[PDB]
Design a binder for this molecule. Structure first.
Ligand code: BR
Ligand code: BR
Ligand code: BR
Ligand code: BR
Ligand code: BR
Ligand code: BR
Ligand code: BR
Ligand code: BR
Ligand code: BR
Ligand code: BR
Ligand code: BR
Ligand code: BR
Ligand code: BR
Ligand code: BR
Ligand code: BR
Ligand code: BR
Ligand code: BR
Ligand code: BR
Ligand code: BR
Ligand code: BR
Ligand code: BR
Ligand code: BR
Ligand code: BR
Ligand code: BR
Ligand code: BR
Ligand code: BR
Ligand code: BR
Ligand code: BR
Ligand code: BR
Ligand code: BR
Ligand code: BR
Ligand code: BR
Ligand code: BR
Ligand code: BR
Ligand code: BR
Ligand code: BR
Ligand code: BR
Ligand code: BR
Ligand code: BR
Ligand code: BR
Ligand code: BR
Ligand code: BR
Ligand code: BR
Ligand code: BR
Ligand code: BR
Ligand code: BR
Ligand code: BR
Ligand code: BR
Ligand code: BR
Ligand code: BR
Ligand code: BR
Ligand code: BR
Ligand code: BR
Ligand code: BR
Ligand code: BR
Ligand code: BR
Ligand code: BR
Ligand code: BR
Ligand code: BR
Ligand code: BR
Ligand code: BR
Ligand code: BR
Ligand code: BR
Ligand code: BR
Ligand code: BR
Ligand code: BR
Ligand code: BR
Ligand code: BR
Ligand code: BR
Ligand code: BR
Ligand code: BR
Ligand code: BR
Ligand code: BR
Ligand code: BR
Ligand code: BR
Lengths: 558, 558, 558
């Protein structure tokens, strides 16, 4: 009775013999990871010892020696996990973990390169290695994530639920990790002087989905994907959920449709979605629930046969309250079942997190009719790490993904991210006359200084040197500048890239230590980016803007 | 046809597929050990080269580099062997071997820490590592030894013979190794100046058993354990074996009972055991064999159906002679079989060692009646390393386990060892009025000095700071001192601990370089330990006393 | 459906379970090799960096550290691959690759020993390691190559084709690699000053065979080996192929016999072989093909039932032309099939190399009658690396195997090589009166100097200190010298050794920097070796002569 895991479908699972060997591969892999962790423990112990007495030659030699051994072991393990043919997909999650550790360790070596070396500045070679490895690890992960996706997508009578299960697990266990790599570059993101383990916080803006779907389903993966998931969009915050009920027959009252009230980041306007489901004759709006608090867990109750006839949905809010949709069907139907959805750090409570261990909050709901009275209901979730105020930290580089903008003009649109950026991107294009414009509103933190200086950096991709107008508005007053992008990528026929690589993202600093943004305490800042007279084939794709506190160190570095 | 090993019962052995994978795990483990040994060979080669020319910077650098690589490899392998889930028990023996090598190597690094390092005294961190690893390796080994033991103990219709086979093999292949770890501490046991590989000799005082038991047996594991093994006791030396025979019917003369004549270490008194078996009507004492020489091999002859009707037993002595029990049954019964018992270093002659390769000697025999004329017969064995004279070496630290005492008062008793000390312990307690007292007689070696100085150290465990009266008698004259123990452990309700940990054993030196024991050549020394007015809840548990030659080095160190 | 490989016959292949585990072993081995290659990549990258700025202490430290880690990993992997019991033969090819890499890396360390070390001359210990490893790797490879050979040789109803397939694959994948090891010794073959990767070119003179044999065949392995392969001989070059056809019945015209016209290296004489096959009544010589250009691919066409009735053979020459044998049978028989033979670097075109990727050329053909009109036809192949002019390079040590001689007297004979020298050897013995003499003609390259000096070295094995007369003839003038061999080996009854070990081959320099060979440009040089009054039990076995350009470096070194 070999154990089965969600990502073992590319191995031979048709027989007990192969399944047993696969089980061994997993067991050996875990043992190798325990060895990796022991090497890391040895490094940390010697590192801490050295830090307490930096001038001790013996401590210095010991940590350098351990750094070299541990670094070699991490790299070797990543190579092994990505080169055991036939098990690439199976080992992708553990590979991502070791790759993650490998890069974090190298970051440590770069931070202390000067102190450890005698000639100093010997971090150049190690830096090139870090960049090379970052590219390799992301490339391998994206390649295999997509290979597995294609396998499930083209599977005969493929089931969408399995396809989605895969995307969700890969996002949580692999893709989210890849998104952290950019922040590990210590030259791009200097380490906190007091606590080197601190990192510029990376946000994962992508949405993952959970859904109640009939099983088996005869609807295609493509059809269900379009009906149950959202097309690319600016990050939204869930504010209200409307529900319709079929009310013609009281003993057959079930959910019939839903609508969503939502808002963009730091926007005072309420957006309204279209209606999902059936809202015609006999289907009436019966509920309008204001979700004033984040929802960290939901449950849905439906009949078993026929399935998917929904009588209730519960929404658990972080403020401890519960909101619910009830069809008020009477009498109560037979065979009701309740399914929970949510994400927890506790492996023991998979779909039932508590207010203390949830990792995602509800962002959307879509209803898709199967037959009269029966529907598939999907729940979209966003990572709890996303800041609803686009707050600018006083003590670290603040990352604010471009999808958290609250304004896009006609030639600015959200496009699908490549998979390693943590979410989607904003493409600024030109129809020949109008150039794409994005506006993102951020909130400064509370501080005593009359004003503080901050640099403004942009992580982007561009297919040509394009002049950008970048500005920031504070208290009705706008200040701007111009800066040109470099050509970071090229694609045949200049089609919007769906496969941007890590190396195709670069950085530009419209505002810096010389001419920084001068911001006051606890104010709403409007930052805007818009190309200046750009051609119809030129493209500027923004991943995120970054706000950099201008300190003495940043000043000298610049 | 996968190979089966005594300790693979915790793996899935119900099918050929799992058995085949398990066979591979064993094969890969052996290959990893061969790699470990090659790393050790490389270290030794470079070490020897450096030793011949210590000042050669190139040799010094080479051995340090190899030490670091080999040390890393040994640790990594120990971690792997203890973290391959589902194979912990299977790999315990090989894990013990690598753990053993890992600690011996670290000992080497500590011994040469000063010469190899440039700042010197850099052995502190390495020392902490050695202590940490020692605790980890013992903990893992004891945990799994006991898990496997419980599995066999609670097995439906469990067979005692399998249970005992397991304890015996685990003792020889794992537990005995753990007992050596304490002696590897170079701060506690300074390395011999001439030959660093020399170690303070550790004695394994535990008894292992072999037995002729009917198969299958309907008697419980608990019942057979009590009937075939000995309750905790001071170490004894086998001096005489008495045998009874059922003599009513000449054609049915078989072994019916046995008694043992034994002596404590360096005791001139002969102790007599109770009679084991049937000694009533028709059962008569027919043999009294004086075992003047150690027995290294035995054989027992019994009928096959019914089995266990014993007609003969042979005892092979190291002086080349043979002693035998013969029931004198006439005529000779049909279906006689002979079974040999013994322990050899030669894997080819399992139960039949020669006078040149035996590892254990006979210490006891117990008979347990199955039915009239049929008996189970157990043979107890002690390790040949145990010194029958408690001799004090002139050139090394002498270890003398407390169980080798020859006197215990009413409040002093032997208690079961935790499994990593090589045998049992002596607990000195108090009934409120009398405190436990133990006396151990040791023999000094032959030397020319009028008298030599020796320190006296005690490895013990205690649940409170208790004052101890420690003395030594030489030529009728007693000299003593007092020293207090430290609190090394605590247990709920102050119950005698059956699970003392390595860290719960500490050391105290009643006699040292300042005030040592002054002993003359080739004399019997009586050493005694007894708490001074101890409370009824206080406990002092002695593992062993150690005699330390007081040399210039020991003097300066103290 | 586990994959099957030619050298897995020593593993349990009788069932799917074992085959599946074996498949995993292969997959894991490939992953380990990918790790090995990554360690090598890291070394190379750091090496190149250091070379560009040798005085950079940081670069120097980095490459030394990587050298140590990578060297440790290569050795560890070689040990693992040779100590995974039950898989020695299966892993022999990959083991040879890692052993090869291990030695090449150590060579690198020796070359840069002085620059990397601070005390210098620290290469002695590393050199001993290299020699030790070379002996170990060759010993393991030869031992297992022969074990596998014996298994196939003594297989019930053993098939010669399988036996030969094995010898051929082992030669290409293992034996040829072993032959390179001698040249890796940097003390024996100093590295090229400009490009350290350059090596003294080693020639593999052995022949491998391909053949069309009936299947199954009732003829023994020994019988077919004798009938289809050549007895030991001096290296020969294929010049002409003669073919006989059975011509009595026009509708049954098939190949009946063949003869070979060949020449020794740099010999103006044409040698004629005996006739192989049937050449009596009804069998007539119909073809005499002059092979003026090397043949890199052949094909043979025969009927299917009965099989082996040959109607055509095509010979693809490197000059782009095609020569063919045609039986002219009429009408064309039914069931004709065509089989191709050849060796390519392209794994996709196994038996069909192109003029751009072939690795071997045709050296011989033998025909063996099965029944009237049906024959087995074997094709012998020599490695394309063999120089047809025994050219003496101007810029490197030239190796010229003794089998490339073109003259041997009565007491000089070719003997079977041990398997690690790349081919056979020349044994110079004595019948008491005449001592063996070998003559090899080499061509100097084109250069402008009136004359250049070259040392002459001999790689040999000898069972006693024997005086050798060594001479070289240039433009009719002979110059000679005498030098004695050392005793390098001993065998019972002084039987010609069939198992010479690496350590049993040593070197002697008849001509050196002091008294070198003085050769002019583009001339044919005749080099001869012949013992001086040698006893009947003395033996001098020559592997190869080596010509050494006498440069300033060689002069100072000598
Ligand atoms: Br799973
Ligand atoms: Br697949
Ligand atoms: Br160190
Ligand atoms: Br890739
Ligand atoms: Br930078
Ligand atoms: Br930094
Ligand atoms: Br820190
Ligand atoms: Br779901
Ligand atoms: Br779910
Ligand atoms: Br559909
Ligand atoms: Br949508
Ligand atoms: Br949008
Ligand atoms: Br609202
Ligand atoms: Br509500
Ligand atoms: Br749950
Ligand atoms: Br606009
Ligand atoms: Br704040
Ligand atoms: Br304002
Ligand atoms: Br401005
Ligand atoms: Br610019
Ligand atoms: Br600009
Ligand atoms: Br392009
Ligand atoms: Br950049
Ligand atoms: Br300003
Ligand atoms: Br345009
Ligand atoms: Br066994
Ligand atoms: Br179990
Ligand atoms: Br070294
Ligand atoms: Br444990
Ligand atoms: Br100590
Ligand atoms: Br020491
Ligand atoms: Br020593
Ligand atoms: Br037994
Ligand atoms: Br036994
Ligand atoms: Br019982
Ligand atoms: Br007892
Ligand atoms: Br006792
Ligand atoms: Br007696
Ligand atoms: Br006797
Ligand atoms: Br035996
Ligand atoms: Br007393
Ligand atoms: Br003595
Ligand atoms: Br006395
Ligand atoms: Br006293
Ligand atoms: Br004290
Ligand atoms: Br005291
Ligand atoms: Br307690
Ligand atoms: Br202590
Ligand atoms: Br005294
Ligand atoms: Br008391
Ligand atoms: Br194959
Ligand atoms: Br075999
Ligand atoms: Br380095
Ligand atoms: Br060998
Ligand atoms: Br040499
Ligand atoms: Br060289
Ligand atoms: Br080079
Ligand atoms: Br062939
Ligand atoms: Br072939
Ligand atoms: Br035959
Ligand atoms: Br021949
Ligand atoms: Br010949
Ligand atoms: Br010709
Ligand atoms: Br032709
Ligand atoms: Br082909
Ligand atoms: Br001659
Ligand atoms: Br030339
Ligand atoms: Br001439
Ligand atoms: Br001459
Ligand atoms: Br000589
Ligand atoms: Br000579
Ligand atoms: Br010999
Ligand atoms: Br030599
Ligand atoms: Br001359
Ligand atoms: Br002679």
């Amino acid at each position: 009775t070999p154990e089965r895991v969600w990502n073992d479908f590319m191995t031979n699972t048709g027989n007990l013999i192969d399944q047993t060997v696969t089980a061994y591969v997993r067991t050996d892999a875990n043992a190798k990871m325990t060895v990796v962790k022991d090497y890391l423990d040895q490094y940390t112990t010697k590192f801490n010892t050295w830090k307490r007495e930096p001038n001790n030659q013996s401590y210095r030699t010991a940590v350098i020696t351990q750094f070299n051994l541990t670094s070699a072991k991490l790299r070797e393990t990543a190579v092994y996990f990505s080169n055991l043919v036939g098990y690439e997909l199976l080992l992708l999650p553990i590979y991502a973990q070791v790759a993650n550790f490998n890069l974090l360790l190298i970051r440590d070596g770069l931070i202390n390169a000067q102190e450890w070396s005698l000639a100093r500045s010997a971090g150049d070679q190690l830096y090139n290695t870090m960049v090379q490895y970052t590219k390799e690890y992301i490339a391998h992960s994206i390649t295999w994530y997509n290979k597995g996706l294609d396998v499930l997508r083209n599977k005969s009578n493929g089931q969408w639920i399995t396809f989605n299960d895969y995307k969700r697990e890969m996002t949580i266990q692999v893709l989210d990790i890849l998104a952290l790599f950019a922040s590990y570059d210590p030259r791009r993101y200097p380490a906190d002087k007091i606590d080197n383990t601190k990192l510029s916080k990376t946000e994962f803006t992508r949405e993952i989905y959970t859904a109640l779907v009939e099983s088996p389903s005869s609807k295609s993966i493509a059809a269900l994907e379009a009906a149950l998931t959202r097309d690319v969009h600016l990050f939204t915050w869930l504010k209200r959920v409307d529900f319709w009920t079929n009310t013609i027959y009281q003993d057959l009252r079930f959910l019939s449709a839903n609508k969503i009230g939502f808002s963009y980041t730091n926007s005072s306007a309420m957006q309204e979605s279209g209606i999902y489901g059936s809202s015609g004759f006999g289907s009436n709006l019966t509920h309008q629930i204001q979700l004033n608090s984040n929802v960290y867990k939901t449950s849905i109750t439906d009949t078993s046969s026929p399935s998917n006839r929904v009588t209730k949905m519960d929404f658990y809010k972080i403020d401890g309250t519960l909101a619910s949709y009830n069809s008020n069907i009477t009498p109560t139907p037979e065979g009701l079942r309740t399914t929970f959805f949510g994400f927890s750090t506790n492996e023991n409570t998979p779909n039932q997190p508590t207010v203390n261990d949830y990792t995602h909050i509800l962002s959307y709901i879509k209803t898709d009719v199967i037959d009269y009275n029966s529907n598939r209901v999907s729940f979209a979730w966003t990572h709890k790490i996303v800041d609803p105020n686009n707050q600018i930290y006083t003590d670290a580089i603040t990352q604010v993904p471009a999808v958290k903008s609250n304004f896009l003009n006609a030639t600015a649109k959200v496009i699908k991210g490549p998979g390693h950026t943590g979410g989607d991107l904003v493409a600024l294009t030109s129809n020949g006359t109008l150039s794409g414009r994005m506006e993102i509103q951020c909130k400064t933190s509370i501080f005593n200084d009359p004003t503080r200086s901050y640099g403004l950096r942009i992580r982007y991709a561009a297919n040509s040197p394009i002049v950008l107008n970048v500005s920031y508005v504070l208290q009705g007053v706008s200040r701007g500048t111009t800066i040109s992008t470099e050509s970071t990528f090229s694609r045949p026929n200049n089609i919007i890239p769906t496969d941007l690589k890590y190396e195709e993202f670069r950085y530009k600093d419209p505002f810096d230590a010389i001419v920084p943004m001068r911001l006051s305490s606890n104010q709403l800042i409007t930052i805007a980016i818009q190309p200046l007279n750009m051609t119809s084939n030129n493209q500027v794709i923004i991943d995120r803007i970054e706000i950099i506190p201008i300190t003495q160190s940043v000043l000298d570095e610049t």
